[PDB]
Amino acid sequence: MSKFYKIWMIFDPRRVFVAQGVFLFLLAVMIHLILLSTPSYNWLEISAAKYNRV
Amino acid sequence: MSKFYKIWMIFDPRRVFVAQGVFLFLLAVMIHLILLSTPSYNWLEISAAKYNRV
Amino acid sequence: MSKFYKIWMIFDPRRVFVAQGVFLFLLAVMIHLILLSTPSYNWLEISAAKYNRV
Amino acid sequence: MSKFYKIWMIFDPRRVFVAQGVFLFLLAVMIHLILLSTPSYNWLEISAAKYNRV
Amino acid sequence: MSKFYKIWMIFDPRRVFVAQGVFLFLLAVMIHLILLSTPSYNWLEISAAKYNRV
Amino acid sequence: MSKFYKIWMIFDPRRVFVAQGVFLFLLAVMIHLILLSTPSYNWLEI
Amino acid sequence: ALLSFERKYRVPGGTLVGGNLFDFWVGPFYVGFFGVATFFFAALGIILIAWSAVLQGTWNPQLISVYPPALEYGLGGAPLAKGGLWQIITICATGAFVSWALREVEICRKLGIGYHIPFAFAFAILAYLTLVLFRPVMMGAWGYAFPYGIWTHLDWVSNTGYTYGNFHYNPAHMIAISFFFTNALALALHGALVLSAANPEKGKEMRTPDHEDTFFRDLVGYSIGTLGIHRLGLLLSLSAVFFSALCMIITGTIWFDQWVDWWQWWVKLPWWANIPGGING
Amino acid sequence: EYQNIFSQVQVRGPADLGMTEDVNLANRSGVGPFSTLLGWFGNAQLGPIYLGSLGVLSLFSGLMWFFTIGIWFWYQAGWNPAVFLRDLFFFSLEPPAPEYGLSFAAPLKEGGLWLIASFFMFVAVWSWWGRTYLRAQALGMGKHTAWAFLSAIWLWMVLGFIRPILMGSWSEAVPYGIFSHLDWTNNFSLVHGNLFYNPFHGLSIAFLYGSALLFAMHGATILAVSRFGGERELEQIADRGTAAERAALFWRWTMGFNATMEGIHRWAIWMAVLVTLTGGIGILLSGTVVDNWYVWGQNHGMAPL
Amino acid sequence: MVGVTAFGNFDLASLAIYSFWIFLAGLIYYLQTENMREGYPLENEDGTPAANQGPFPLPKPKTFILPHGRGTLTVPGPESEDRPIALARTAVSEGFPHAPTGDPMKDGVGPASWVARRDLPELDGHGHNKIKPMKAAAGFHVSAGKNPIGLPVRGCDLEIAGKVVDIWVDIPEQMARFLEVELKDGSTRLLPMQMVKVQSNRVHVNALSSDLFAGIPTIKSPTEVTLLEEDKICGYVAGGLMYAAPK
Amino acid sequence: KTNLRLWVAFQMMKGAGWAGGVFFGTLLLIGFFRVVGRMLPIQENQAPAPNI
Amino acid sequence: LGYTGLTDEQAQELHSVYMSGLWLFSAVAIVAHLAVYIWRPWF
Amino acid sequence: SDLGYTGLTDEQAQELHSVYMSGLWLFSAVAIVAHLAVYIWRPWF
Amino acid sequence: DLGYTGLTDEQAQELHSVYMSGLWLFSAVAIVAHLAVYIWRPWF
Amino acid sequence: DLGYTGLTDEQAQELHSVYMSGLWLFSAVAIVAHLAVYIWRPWF
Ligand SMILES: CCCCCCCCCCCCCCCCCC(=O)OC[C@H](COP(=O)([O-])OCC(O)COP(=O)([O-])OC[C@@H](COC(=O)CCCCCCCCCCCCCCCCC)OC(=O)CCCCCCCCCCCCCCCCC)OC(=O)CCCCCCCCCCCCCCCCC
Ligand code: BCL
Ligand SMILES: COC(C)(C)C/C=C/C(C)=C/C=C/C(C)=C/C=C/C(C)=C/C=C/C=C(C)/C=C/C=C(\C)CC/C=C(\C)CCC=C(C)C
Ligand SMILES: COC(C)(C)C/C=C/C(C)=C/C=C/C(C)=C/C=C/C(C)=C/C=C/C=C(C)/C=C/C=C(\C)CC/C=C(\C)CCC=C(C)C
Ligand SMILES: COC(C)(C)C/C=C/C(C)=C/C=C/C(C)=C/C=C/C(C)=C/C=C/C=C(C)/C=C/C=C(\C)CC/C=C(\C)CCC=C(C)C
Ligand SMILES: [Fe+2]
């Protein structure tokens, strides 16, 4: 549990950091687009309906 | 979190700066295009309605 | 901010200058085309309507 | 601004001159074509309408 | 104005003359075809209509 | 036209003559085709 | 400007037309007589595409289309706004392609290499001329050629194909498709093999051509070799293009009906034509 | 005048058994016969071939798939050899009817035999992929062939497995026949609007044409510099010679930029894997995301409104 | 998901196409930088580093480990010609040809150029020489073609220049690579197999006139040929196409 | 020089003759295709216009 | 970490001239936007 | 120091820039006159 | 002093003089042609 | 003198004289042809 630092002697930090960055960005973009295509969580349209911007 | 500077002992600053510039520009363009595609928050059409330009 | 000049120690000035010129020209052309696509900011058609030229 | 001449220490004059000539010609052609696409600035059709030539 | 003759310190006249001939012929052909495309200034059709050749 | 003859100290005259013959022939063919496509001036049609 | 080894190769000779005239480089490009011709024709064709876009009334590069003359003009000239711009652009394209091939010939003989590349390019030029010149001439109208638009020439492909029903019942068409698929497969295999030999597992020496031969003999029991694979690549590509040109040249000229109906000569062969079973019986 | 298309003299020597890096030599066969006909164009030697566990698995599964389709064809002919030869190219194993969904309850005649054949094919293809990977590994080479094959497998899996599952029906899959899968291709285009207006379809076609273009260019270049021993590219990578420089300078003087003796193969592998990758994506999007590609093109600036 | 858009007309297909455009730009950048491992930095016509170098930066070095203990190769790396070039400028401006100072075929410039490759023979997977004379090869014989041994060799001037003595064979590929030609003075030269046309009664060399055969570079060992010697021979024979056009 | 006049004329004519030979050869090829299509039954069976 | 071969003084001078050019470009752009906003505001 | 990548000295760069600016101002003056003529003939604002 | 093409100062001056003579001749012909076209059929 | 082509001044003068004679002959023939066509069928 406290020996999780041992992972850095098996993976080199460069590849892990690049892979993690790409993964995190793509996951966040996908989640945002999923929320944006759902009418109940499209915050732009919610704001449009709340303030009568139509 | 103080010693975040040691990232530059792992990542070449030349590659990171180019990648970051490309990423930031593409993200800004994407968000602006999202806003232009929304009938609200399209500042050009908002002003056209506000000043009776149609 | 007082040390932003060291980017020229990181990046070669002439490659940056060429890339910057291309980027600025393409950005300006993009914005002008976006304005010409908008009926309420196409200055040619605005002048056609103003002076009644058909 | 008084030291803008050092760009010729950065850039080779003849490559810049060739690129500049190509850029200027293409820009001029682009603008002329854009004007000819507009009904209210196509000077050939403006003269056709003015002198009643069909 | 008076020092423009130094352009021949930058460019060998042979390649310049080849490029200038190509450019001027291309431009002239462009303009002639542009005029021929329009119903006005198509001198062949203008003459046909003027002399009722049909 | 005072010193135009110095063009022959820039370009080799044999090559220029051959290339000029090619250019003139192609230009003549281009103009003749443009004339043929028009309903008038089509001397073959008439 | 120059590559580290380029200087010893730039020597005065190998031209077909002209001499020291036009025997120079502009940056990396070599510009002979046919370099000048190619540049003129290409620039004129591109500016004429732009002017056709102006006449059409669209600036969307995916909506720009230059249509050939209508069928009622036959093989004669047409007005510029209606069919003539397409004809001038076709002439410019043919000139640009031929001048490009001849420029490649000049470069080849300046470098002392064989003329395999201009020959291979001439194959593609001939396929283009089959679609745009030979088939329209045999069918008797410029209106059977395709338009110059990114998505409208796909409309030409679809209409031409569906005139004869499902078009991949054309037999030469089947041969051409098989050649294209085999070519893509062989290109993938060849690139992968050379890269796998030059980039072995980490920390190992480069592999030899013996290792490549061994790999393919282990996999499929045969290795064609290096000379063999390059010969095979050239021949597969050229055969694909040749059979595509053939299948289009026979389509509106010798054949006139559904190709699926062509495949019925085999079924109606006398010594099994009436046996009652299966699909066609 | 000699264009190096066909060899003019042919020589033979002792057969080359191959390298022994850490390949299990007990799983190799003997060398086959030399063929003069093949030797005119490439190598004459046939074999040896490596057969291992995955070779056995792939051969058994592929033979069973082939035999299942063949026995179904023989059944459709009524066991008549004349009808079998006449209506070959017209027989077809069809997937289950649309009303069965993804279920496995379809009868043998109405799509169950198609499921059996498909299972055999699945096993055969994946074991062959594993075989390519392991044959590369035994010789100490990189796994580029396995990844290119993985691209091809991606398109195959989308056509036969992934897309039918997302659509919720085995009837979406491709039948096993010569003319029937051509009919399937045409009907797939007709049902989904016009497949020409699928952008990934266009990209796939661009990369197929590009494979033909790049392969013709590269074969011609290597044959043109083969007078300097340019075909021996693995050595031209390690020790650059006049062949590589002449090829690079030809393409540089022609189109303004060139490749190396290794970068050109990088271009090659990517040009092919891209046709198959973009094709897989374009087929996956059809019917699950876009039902009418022409209308999609109209809404996306590709077709006139 | 048919008709589900996050904004505007942007659905999973639009997301896919834009993601692919980004991926394709990145892939093209990678492919060009990988192609930039030979011939860079760009040089002036006088040998100095050019002012301009291009839109793509030079890639990080990678090392090849050559087999049979031949060493390593790190590219990109310092690249030098390591041979004199007998060419003179025809113009002060750049972009014009360089004219040969002496005999181009002897000097090895133009289409007659060669590269300073390693002075060792090419090896096979087992360490033996890749290319051997068919006499020294064990069990090799001509199988199905016209056997060139004993045929006269005719140059581009339609004159006899020698006779074929042996065939040099690529042992792993099992293909003929060179023809060994004995001249009138009892000396032998190597001719690339790709540059000769073997006819019924003769071998015809279109690239090289009969007198120029004596000028072909020789091999210092009768039993093997190195990479450098192969460069010289192939470059000479190919340069004959341009530099033996008269006669 | 009269020889100079004839030499310039000969160079012009060489260029013009090569251009004319190429142009007329293309026309002869077009005529070949036109004739072989005239001998074919295209008139009886004409395809509809592919361009719309 | 020179990375380009420039010294400290060279980098300072190049950045000074670059910033002069950037401020000139920005001033022209600001005047253009002021003119457009007076002519036809977008807020 | 020089920082030059192009081989020009300081005086050479100054002279080249002077001539280039003369040409640029001539081109700009011609363009300004052309725009004035077009705007008088047919204003776009 | 600056040299890229091998021309001296006098050579450049003479070449530019002849080039400008040719340019002015071409421009004069073009001006006459435009005057004729504008009289025949003005475009303004 | 630049002398990229190896011609002297007198050689260039003589070559240009003959070239101009040929050019004027060609132009005269073209002028007569245009006069004939314009009389037969004017285009203005
Ligand atoms: C999201 C969009 C934007 C994304 C990013 C945008 C940012 C900018 C662009 C960045 C991208 C630049 C790409 C350039 C990379 C250069 C690669 C290279 O050639 O060599 C370098 C490097 C090694 O070079 P080397 O010097 O030769 O090494 C030799 C070694 O010494 C010894 O050899 P080795 O053992 O190491 O193997 C060598 C091999 C090593 O290559 C690999 O390892 C590839 C691994 C397989 C691909 C991963 C997907 C497989 C399916 C997932 C299941 C397994 C995951 C992988 C498991 C990893 C285990 C290691 O390297 C190669 O050269 C291979 C050349 C050809 C590879 C072809 C790959 C075909 C993939 C088939 C896909 C099937 C499913 C697709 C599903 C749909 C996807 C859209 O190879 C790689 O890094 C391969 C890159 C793999 C990319 C996969 C394709 C991605 C598709 C996305 C398309 C865009 C999205 C469109 C739809 C979106 C919908 C929303
Ligand atoms: C009316 C018909 C439709 C149409 C419908 C389709 C459909 C439907 C599809 C295509 C697909 C493709 N089409 Mg389309 N197509 C049309 C018109 C065209 C035109 C044209 C000029 O008009 C062209 C050039 C193309 C070209 C293409 C290809 C780029 C693409 C296939 C890639 C490939 O290699 O697949 C061939 C390769 C494979 C299928 C991979 C196979 C891999 C497996 C692993 C192999 C296993 C072998 C097996 C075990 C057998 C063993 C044999 C023994 C070992 C010997 N089409 C029109 C619009 N086309 C595909 C695509 O990707 O679309 C996006 C597709 O699915
Ligand atoms: C869609 O958007 C639309 C098109 C509507 C509008 C968009 C508009 C924007 C994007 C266009 C932007 C254009 C750019 C910014 C314009 C820049 C123009 C400048 C750069 C042109 C400058 C030209 C200078 C030339 C004319 C100078 C020439 C000098 C003489 C010809 C030669 C002098 C050189 C001397 C001789 C060098 C030798 C001296 C030494 C001592 C030897
Ligand atoms: C869809 O979204 C829309 C388009 C609607 C909106 C999106 C907007 C966003 C995404 C656009 C973002 C744009 C970026 C962020 C703008 C940045 C602009 C800056 C970077 C431009 C700076 C330009 C500086 C130039 C003008 C400087 C020039 C300096 C002189 C020309 C030369 C000076 C160099 C000297 C001479 C170097 C030599 C000195 C040494 C000593 C030799
Ligand atoms: C779509 O847009 C449209 C087409 C409607 C309109 C757009 C128009 C714009 C984009 C067109 C721009 C056109 C350009 C900028 C026009 C420039 C024209 C100038 C550059 C022409 C100059 C011609 C000069 C030539 C005629 C000089 C000829 C001199 C020879 C007759 C003799 C020279 C021989 C000397 C030099 C020998 C010297 C050697 C001794 C040893 C001294
Ligand atoms: Fe290869």
Q: Which residues of E touch N38 (CB under 8 A)?
A: none
Task: Please check whether residue I238 is in contact with residue H228, taking contact to mean a CB–CB distance below 8 angstroms.
Answer: yes
Closest CA to G176 of G249, G125, G108, G122: G249
Distance L6 CA to ligand 4 centre (A): 23
Smallest Cβ–Cβ distance between G206 and the set I39, I66, I90 belongs to I66
C-alpha M11/C-alpha M16 separation (Å) is: 8
CA H153 vs CA F18, H128, H215, I195, M38: distances in Å: 59, 11, 22, 43, 69
C-alpha E14/C-alpha N3 separation (Å) is: 12
For ligand 4, atom 36, the nearest C-alpha belongs to D7
Distance D19 CA to ligand 3 centre (A): 10
Q: Do M15 and E5 touch (CB under 8 A)?
A: yes
Count CB-CB contacts under 10 A for residue I8: 14
Task: Please check whether residue M42 is in contact with residue D51, taking contact to mean a CB–CB distance below 8 angstroms.
Answer: yes
Identify the burial level of A6 via C-beta atoms within 10 angstroms of its C-beta, where 0-12 means exposed, 13-18 middle and 19 or more buried.
exposed
List, in sequence order, every beta strand (DSSP E) within chain G.
Answer: 24-26, 29-31, 65-66, 148-149
Pocket test residue of G189, G194, G199 for ligand 1, highest count of atoms within 8 A of CB: G199
Closest CA to J22 of F27, F25, G34, G137: F25
My answer on whether omega of the bond before J50 falls inside 30° of 0, hence cis, is: no
Closest-approach residue (CA) in chain H for G220? H49
C-alpha H224/C-alpha H209 separation (Å) is: 22
User: How many helices (H) and strands (E) are present in chain K, helices listed first?
Assistant: 1, 0
Distance G177 CA to ligand 2 centre (A): 9
Phi, psi angle pair for I100, to nearest 5°: -60, 140
Task: Please check whether residue E12 is in contact with residue M5, taking contact to mean a CB–CB distance below 8 angstroms.
Answer: yes
Count CB-CB contacts under 10 A for residue H51: 16
Binding-site residue numbers of D are 32
Q: What domains does chain E contain, in order, with CATH numbers?
A: 5-51 (4.10.220.20)
Phi, psi angle pair for L15, to nearest 5°: -65, -45
Task: Please check whether residue H39 is in contact with residue H10, taking contact to mean a CB–CB distance below 8 angstroms.
Answer: yes
Q: Which residues of E touch F11 (CB under 8 A)?
A: 14, 17
Residue G221 corresponds to which amino acid?
A: G
C-alpha N24/C-alpha N39 separation (Å) is: 22
Q: What domains does chain J contain, in order, with CATH numbers?
A: 1-41 (1.20.5.920)
My answer on whether omega of the bond before G136 falls inside 30° of 0, hence cis, is: no
B32 marked among binding-site residues: yes
Assigned token pair, D41: 């600035």
Q: State how far residue D26 is from chain M, nearest Cα, in angstroms.
A: 22
Closest-approach residue (CA) in chain L for K9? L1
Task: Please check whether residue H200 is in contact with residue H278, taking contact to mean a CB–CB distance below 8 angstroms.
Answer: yes
Count CB-CB contacts under 10 A for residue G30: 26
Q: Which residues of H touch G168 (CB under 8 A)?
A: 182, 185-186
Atom of ligand 4 nearest to the CA of C31: 4
Closest CA to H153 of H4, H276, H14, H274: H276
Q: Do D3 and K20 touch (CB under 8 A)?
A: yes
Mention every residue, 6+ apart, whose C-beta is less than 8 A from residue J22. Answer: none
Mention every residue, 6+ apart, whose C-beta is less than 8 A from residue I226. Answer: I117, I118, I119, I120, I121, I219
| CB of K29 closer than 6 angstroms to any ligand 4 atom | no
Q: Do E3 and L22 touch (CB under 8 A)?
A: yes
Assigned token pair, G12: 């005065």
DSSP state of G72: G
Q: What angle do CA I181, I183, I188 make, to 5 degrees?
A: 50
Q: At what angle do helices I12-35 and H263-285 cross, to 10 degrees?
A: 180
Reading phi first (left if > 0) and then psi (alpha if -120 to 50, else beta), residue J40 is in beta
Task: Please check whether residue I170 is in contact with residue G213, taking contact to mean a CB–CB distance below 8 angstroms.
Answer: no
Closest CA to H46 of H55, H38, H54: H38
Assigned token pair, H104: 């496995």
DSSP SS3 for H12: strand
Atom of ligand 4 nearest to the CA of D4: 36
Q: Which residues of E touch M2 (CB under 8 A)?
A: 6, 9
Q: State how far residue L1 is from chain K, nearest Cα, in angstroms.
A: 7
- Which of L1, L15, L16, L17 would best serve as a mutation to test chain D binding (most D beta carbons within 10 A)? L17
Mention every residue, 6+ apart, whose C-beta is less than 8 A from residue G256. Answer: J45, J47
Instruction: Please check whether residue I8 touches B, CB under 8 A.
Output: yes
| CB of K25 closer than 6 angstroms to any ligand 4 atom | yes
Q: State how far residue B37 is from chain I, nearest Cα, in angstroms.
A: 5
DSSP state of H95: P
C-alpha G179/C-alpha G177 separation (Å) is: 5
Pocket test residue of B24, B25, B26, B29 for ligand 4, highest count of atoms within 8 A of CB: B29
Q: What's the full length of chain H, in residues?
A: 305
- Subunits next to B (3 or more Cβ pairs <8 Å) are A, C, I, K
- Subunits next to H (3 or more Cβ pairs <8 Å) are G, I
Atom of ligand 3 nearest to the CA of L15: 41
C-alpha I226/C-alpha I131 separation (Å) is: 9
CA D44 vs CA C22, D31, E34, E42, L43: distances in Å: 33, 16, 10, 11, 17
Task: Please check whether residue I211 is in contact with residue I190, taking contact to mean a CB–CB distance below 8 angstroms.
Answer: no
| Complete DSSP assignment for L1-45 | ----SS---HHHHHHHHHHHHHHHHHHHHHHHHHHHHHHHHS---
For ligand 5, atom 38, the nearest C-alpha belongs to M15
Cα-to-chain-centroid distance, residue H20: 28
Closest CA to G10 of G26, G24, G21, G22: G24
| CB of D9 closer than 6 angstroms to any ligand 5 atom | no
C-alpha C35/C-alpha C27 separation (Å) is: 12
Q: Which residues of D touch L18 (CB under 8 A)?
A: 5
Q: Do G253 and J42 touch (CB under 8 A)?
A: yes
DSSP state of E40: T
Element (H, E) at G218: helix G209-220
Closest CA to H76 of H114, H128, H105: H114
Distance E10 CA to ligand 3 centre (A): 17
Domain at I105-244: CATH architecture: Alpha-Beta Complex (3.90)
Instruction: Please check whether residue I57 touches C, CB under 8 A.
Output: yes
C-alpha H194/C-alpha G154 separation (Å) is: 10
For ligand 2, atom 66, the nearest C-alpha belongs to H283
DSSP state of J49: P
- Cβ contacts from D onto K, under 8 A: 9
Distance E54 CA to ligand 2 centre (A): 54
